[PDB]
Design a protein around this motif. Structure first.
Motif, PDB file in Angstrom:
ATOM      1  N   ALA A 280       0.854  -1.189   0.000  1.00 18.85           N
ATOM      2  CA  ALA A 280       0.000   0.000   0.000  1.00 18.85           C
ATOM      3  C   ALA A 280       0.891   1.241   0.000  1.00 18.85           C
ATOM      4  O   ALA A 280       1.156   1.862   1.033  1.00 18.85           O
TER       5      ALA A 280
ATOM      6  N   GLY B 267       1.207   2.458   8.382  1.00 23.10           N
ATOM      7  CA  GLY B 267       0.278   1.542   7.765  1.00 23.10           C
ATOM      8  C   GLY B 267       1.004   0.305   7.281  1.00 23.10           C
ATOM      9  O   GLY B 267       2.053  -0.088   7.806  1.00 23.10           O
ATOM     10  N   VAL B 268       0.438  -0.314   6.244  1.00 19.66           N
ATOM     11  CA  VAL B 268       1.051  -1.503   5.662  1.00 19.66           C
ATOM     12  C   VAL B 268       2.456  -1.197   5.166  1.00 19.66           C
ATOM     13  O   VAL B 268       3.368  -2.016   5.315  1.00 19.66           O
TER      14      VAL B 268
ATOM     15  N   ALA C 139      -7.471   1.177   2.226  1.00 20.01           N
ATOM     16  CA  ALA C 139      -8.020   0.927   3.549  1.00 20.01           C
ATOM     17  C   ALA C 139      -7.056   1.457   4.611  1.00 20.01           C
ATOM     18  O   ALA C 139      -6.028   2.077   4.309  1.00 20.01           O
TER      19      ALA C 139
ATOM     20  N   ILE D  69      -5.072   3.622   7.028  1.00 24.46           N
ATOM     21  CA  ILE D  69      -4.784   5.052   7.106  1.00 24.46           C
ATOM     22  C   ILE D  69      -4.999   5.793   5.794  1.00 24.46           C
ATOM     23  O   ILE D  69      -4.907   7.025   5.778  1.00 24.46           O
TER      24      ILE D  69
HETATM   25 CL   LIG Z   1      -2.034   0.741   5.353  1.00 15.63          CL
END
Ligand SMILES: [Cl-]
Ligand SMILES: Cc1[nH]c2ncnc(NC[C@H]3NC(=O)CC3(C)C)c2c1C
Length: 167
Positions: A36, A46-47, A127, A129
């Motif tokens: 992401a 995040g990811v 998805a 943040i």
């Molecule tokens: Cl993320």
């Protein structure tokens, strides 16, 4: 047959599991893990922040060289870089960030990048943040990706909601 284990089958080609994509990648070592990403490939949170940390920042070092050479990605775009210790390749895909005002119609374009790879491990684009509705992200994914996609969903509560609401 592939090494992915414990997934629920949503459609002919989409599978889903409550799992940390980092731990899932380290175990499966898939051909392609999806990040992401943002256009600058700045993998802070995040990811993206989590995946980079698992590579001991090697993902960020590689990414900074990529940006210095090529400039930023497009929202909706992608690039293929190394998967480091997590996968053969990492497909960095830029979903729109709603917390930046970016058009959600670009989410479909983002998922189209997955069709260039026969099998992938991936998060729901935009998805977390990035601020989009994960239920919508799963829907666009199902209606756009035609190759075999294994979705890792970190949050157990979200995973249960995604499964129970899936049409
Ligand atoms: Cl993320
Ligand atoms: C460490 C880690 N591992 C993950 N694996 C898969 N997806 C992730 N987040 C993207 C979106 N999917 C979710 O469940 C939460 C969300 C931010 C809405 C993550 C994260 C942060």
């Amino acid at each position: 047959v592939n090494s992915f284990s414990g997934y629920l089958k949503l459609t002919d080609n989409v599978y889903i599991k409550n799992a940390d994509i980092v731990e899932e990648a380290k175990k499966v070592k898939p051909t392609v893990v999806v990040n992401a990403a943002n256009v600058y490939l700045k993998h802070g949170g995040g990811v993206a922040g989590a995946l980079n940390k698992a590579t001991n920042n090697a993902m960020q070092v590689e990414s900074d060289d990529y940006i210095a050479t090529n400039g930023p990605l497009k929202v909706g775009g992608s690039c293929v870089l190394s998967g480091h210790n997590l996968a053969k390749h990492c497909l960095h895909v830029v979903g729109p960030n709603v917390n930046k005002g970016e058009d959600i119609q670009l989410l479909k374009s983002a998922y189209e990048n997955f069709n260039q790879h026969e099998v992938l491990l991936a998060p729901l684009l935009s998805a977390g943040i990035f601020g989009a509705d994960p239920i919508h992200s799963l829907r666009v994914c199902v209606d756009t990706v035609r190759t075999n996609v294994y979705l890792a969903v970190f949050d157990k509560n979200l995973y249960d909601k995604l499964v129970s609401s899936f049409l």
